[PDB]
Symmetry: C5
Amino acid sequence: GVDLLGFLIITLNCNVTMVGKLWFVLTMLLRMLVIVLAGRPVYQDEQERFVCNTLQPGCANVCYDVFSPVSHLRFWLIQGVCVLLPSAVFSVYVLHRGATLAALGPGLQVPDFSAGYIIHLLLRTLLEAAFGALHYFLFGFLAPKKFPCTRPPCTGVVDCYVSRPTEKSLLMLFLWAVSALSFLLGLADLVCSLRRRMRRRP
Amino acid sequence: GVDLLGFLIITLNCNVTMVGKLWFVLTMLLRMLVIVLAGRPVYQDEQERFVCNTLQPGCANVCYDVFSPVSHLRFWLIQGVCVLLPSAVFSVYVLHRGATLAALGPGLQVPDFSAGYIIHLLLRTLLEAAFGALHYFLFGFLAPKKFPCTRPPCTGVVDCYVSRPTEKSLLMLFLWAVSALSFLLGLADLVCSLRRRMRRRP
Amino acid sequence: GVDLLGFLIITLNCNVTMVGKLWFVLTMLLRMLVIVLAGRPVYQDEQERFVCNTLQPGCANVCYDVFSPVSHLRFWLIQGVCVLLPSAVFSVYVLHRGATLAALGPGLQVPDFSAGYIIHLLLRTLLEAAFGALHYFLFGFLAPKKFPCTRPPCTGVVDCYVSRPTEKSLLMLFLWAVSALSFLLGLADLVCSLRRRMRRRP
Amino acid sequence: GVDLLGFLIITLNCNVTMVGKLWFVLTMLLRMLVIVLAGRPVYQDEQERFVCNTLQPGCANVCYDVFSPVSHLRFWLIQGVCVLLPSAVFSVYVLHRGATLAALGPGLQVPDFSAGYIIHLLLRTLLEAAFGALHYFLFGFLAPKKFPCTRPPCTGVVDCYVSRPTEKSLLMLFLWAVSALSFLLGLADLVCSLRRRMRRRP
Amino acid sequence: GVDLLGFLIITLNCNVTMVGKLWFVLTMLLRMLVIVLAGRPVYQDEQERFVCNTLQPGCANVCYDVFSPVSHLRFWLIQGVCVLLPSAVFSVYVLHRGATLAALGPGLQVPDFSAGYIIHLLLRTLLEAAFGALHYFLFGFLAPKKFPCTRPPCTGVVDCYVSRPTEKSLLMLFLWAVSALSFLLGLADLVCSLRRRMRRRP
């Protein structure tokens, strides 16, 4: 005996575990906020102050283009969005299936969206290992200090100096630690919400 | 027997299909977020580091002005806004026609806004083909690496070097793939929500 | 027989026409979003790359200061805010007069805020003609391509080159078209919501 | 006979006058939006283009540091936040005292938070005169056009040119007018909500 | 006898004291807003205008990298996020335990989340002393005005000039004062919400 803004929050809370909620808080307060606020200013002058020891115009542009085919700030952003996509698709599905069932009508009788949670957890877990492997195989662990350049529109070999590599290496380690910690939180929910299912099935 | 914050969400959910909701999520989490967050920093120094091999002041300004009459970041933003406009006009219309009917008053009796959905889908689908054609005929597929300039306030032919073309070409391909995938989602909803209409009409 | 979050949306929806709602959508999705997102990056380097053919320090600063006493981005922002102010004052007034009347108490009995709509429409319409006239008399229709400078801390006449004038001229024409189209929407509501009033008064 | 999302808006609306609501709208739509959106771009290159007629490195840095100990954009932001703080503390107090009283329980019986309004108005009014006096005694009314510098790491007296002083002086006058107009709105509410109190006390 | 959007706000308000609410307002209106809005522009050109008295390319990059291993803006942001994390975890826990208990069902009967408040307060208080100690031992109290550099890719000892140190020193003192004031607010809530607990236990 509740209103429509009643049994529309219980039907979404009772189908998600506390571990998932705290994972959501951790993944949106320590990952999607640090990247936007403290990641953009750091990588604002990666090309402006990429000083190369040369004088022929155009050597610096190609040298920088060869040095970094794609900066890892965009890699972090893409990985963060692709991790959060399944957590939104499932929420939309739950809302659609919960707000349409009350229209027909008949101490609560909330639906049971449990079979749609394990698949979501599996997809989210699988989407992180591939991204971690790509991160390791593309960017390594720490940024380099100087780069040698040989692609000639210019004459010779030009050694260029990277800008503020220590802070970049610190931020990379921080994000690595955050992702590693968040992987275990999502792995512990799949092994706990699946052993709690076969128990309640005589 | 529901309140006003009751039969004001069902009357908006029952008139939109799950395909449309997931298209909305995809078009606002992978298109309107990537452009704002990762598109602005990339195109921040397109003119600052457009190095030209010349010394007469003023050759660089006109050469850049001839090179790019309009950058494609603004094109992407305009296309994204113009695609989402019909999806907001219909929502406003539904809210206006749903919150006014309950004022008069008489196991639910929700209205049927189905004839106003096919027209919206047709307009949204038609608004994307023209923009795709314009994108292909204006910007091509990949960015160039060097530009020749002849418009003289300066003396001769000046070859200028574009800044970070590889990352720009990667982002353009990503956005092309996203738009191509989103077109089929909007096309499959029109062919499914129209065959499901003539069935329920004896 | 509704709650307080009941007859507090009808009392605000029944007093505003569909034309006004779609005008609100149009002038907040195509005017206040384009200016913020695509207007700031364009006018970010108007002074940084205002190249002048001189060598005496300080000629460029005064030449730019004489060239543009006030950029038109701030003009657009001020006009946009001053247009939207009346649409918020009336909403605040309606909420204040609707949430205080239900406290006393006595198939609905919603209030009639119609006399307070024509005055709002008249003020909003009058606030746009003056701004349009100021825009035409201050900035013209197209940006110039080069500027002559004579105010001497420097020696002679210095011709400076403006940065990316074609894109600026395209954006300003787009904004002109948007404002011109929005003026007629606000003019057609005053002539329709006033002829529909004298009819219902025997 | 209302819900909790019922007698939680009347208990906040009935304790605030229309003058206060319109002052809030004016102070958050014409003061906290202009500063953020149009104040940040103007003061973005105050140091980048502070051209000084010298050649010894380091003279420009100290000359700029002596010229502007603190820019007035931060002064405006601090004043704006410190003005709005009392208007939020009182709202939090009202919510806390209104949501806890309905738990115990017993044509409405709304509480009377009037003695807590005059003190808030007095504090808000007193917090603006001091800031106005500080603004006048620190920044004056109009920005200067050129600055003489004598603090030597360099040799001699160096005259530097300020960047775009006319637009800065226009924005300063606009903000001065806005603050002066807003002071009277807060002064007229204290003299009206206090004469309307002794009347209703036989 | 309330709805679900009823006994879901009382169960969260009655478990938090007014001191905590005003601390939240203070630590989100004077700490998380000043840093984002007035902290980013100040530290935007810390490396761009770090002038060094040398001519060999690459000396400036390493000199700046040695001078500031990590800027204190990121330190402030990390400390602010880590302070607010416990205040969000507890809120999520309260919502989860309050929205699930009403599903089963049985002048109010709100739960008592008091034992879960002292632990949260203790963790939040302990998380600030360590950060304050780190701030003192890493950045001191005032920024320096000039830096000597000896790490050679360059020849000799190079004295570089910091950019706008006075404003940085003023902002750092302001943030120090804000943090010091906020520490006592969180300390006085633990000593008051613990003496008020043993009283109500015969």
